[PDB]
Amino acid sequence: HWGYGKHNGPEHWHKDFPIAKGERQSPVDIDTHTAKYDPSLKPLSVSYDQATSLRILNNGHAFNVEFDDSQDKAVLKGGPLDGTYRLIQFHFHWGSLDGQGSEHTVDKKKYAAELHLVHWNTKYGDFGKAVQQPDGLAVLGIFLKVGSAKPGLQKVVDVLDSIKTKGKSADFTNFDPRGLLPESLDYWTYPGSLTTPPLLECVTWIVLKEPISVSSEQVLKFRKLNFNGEGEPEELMVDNWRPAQPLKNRQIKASFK
Ligand SMILES: CCN[C@H]1CN(CCCOC)S(=O)(=O)c2sc(S(N)(=O)=O)cc21
Numbered sequence: 330h331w332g333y334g335k336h337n338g339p340e341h342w343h344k345d346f347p348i349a350k351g352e353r354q355s356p357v358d359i360d361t362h363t364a365k366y367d368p369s370l371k372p373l374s375v376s377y378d379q380a381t382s383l384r385i386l387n388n389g390h391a392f393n394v395e396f397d398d399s400q401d402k403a404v405l406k407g408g409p410l411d412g413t414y415r416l417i418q419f420h421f422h423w424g425s426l427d428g429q430g431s432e433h434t435v436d437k438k439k440y441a442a443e444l445h446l447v448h449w450n451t452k453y454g455d456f457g458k459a460v461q462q463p464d465g466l467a468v469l470g471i472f473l474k475v476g477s478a479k480p481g482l483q484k485v486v487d488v489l490d491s492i493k494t495k496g497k498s499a500d501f502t503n504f505d506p507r508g509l510l511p512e513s514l515d516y517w518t519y520p521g522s523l524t525t526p527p528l529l530e531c532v533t534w535i536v537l538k539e540p541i542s543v544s545s546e547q548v549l550k551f552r553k554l555n556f557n558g559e560g561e562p563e564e565l566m567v568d569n570w571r572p573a574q575p576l577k578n579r580q581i582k583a584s585f586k
Pocket residue numbers: 390417418445447460468522523524525526527
């Protein structure tokens with residue numbers, strides 16, 4: 330089974346999933362000097378005032394927080410999109426030192442971690458049907474750096490010792506995602522895919538320019554988790570990111586001058 334080690338990491342994935350060498354793969358490096366400003370784009374519209382969270386889980390690859398998507402309650406629209414996209418889950422990727430951790434890079438620079446918020450297009454009915462189409466998903470990414478603490482992240486870090494190993498879950502209600510966003514909403518955008526297998530080419534990426542700050546005691550807690558199951562040898566959950574792939578066919582656009 331796939332993973333991030335010496336014998337089953339990124340350089341091996343193509344043997345079971347051939348699309349790994351396709352024409353619109355992610356992540357990539359963003360060169361700020363080549364990107365072109367586009368004056369016809371529209372501002373982003375984020376409406377999370379009615380969100381209902383349910384549970385938190387460790388899946389062997391990272392940890393995820395889930396929401397109830399049976400009605401329009403937390404949605405994303407505008408920007409380069411046409412239509413309405415509904416929120417289903419969020420997760421993170423990080424490193425073993427403060428100098429590495431993120432998947433996307435800026436003029437060759439790497440940050441300590443990267444946060445991903447996932448949404449699907451309502452015209453298709455539900456989630457499973459949407460991942461099989463070219464314009465099915467929309468993912469919003471935000472960078473993390475080490476400095477002062479972020480108040481709204483604390484409730485997540487205090488529950489981690491109850492889901493240490495693979496297969497564990499716990500109740501997690503009334504959490505508000507508006508507390509993890511920066512001041513400004515200016516961005517970059519291009520067409521791509523998922524960053525872990527099955528690697529399907531169904532995503533419209535939207536990456537924010539301004540990062541958020543967290544303390545060293547907070548990211549320390551992330552590194553104490555495990556990749557293995559209860560009653561098995563200990564392997565620490567660190568360095569779970571895929572590196573930069575070829576641009577080829579595409580061009581990147583910016584909403585700011
Ligand atoms: C471990 C498998 N992770 C996949 C599969 N997915 C199904 C998980 C059930 O949750 C609904 S997913 O479509 O949600 C999604 S989004 C991304 S990313 N890193 O944002 O590009 C990876 C994935």
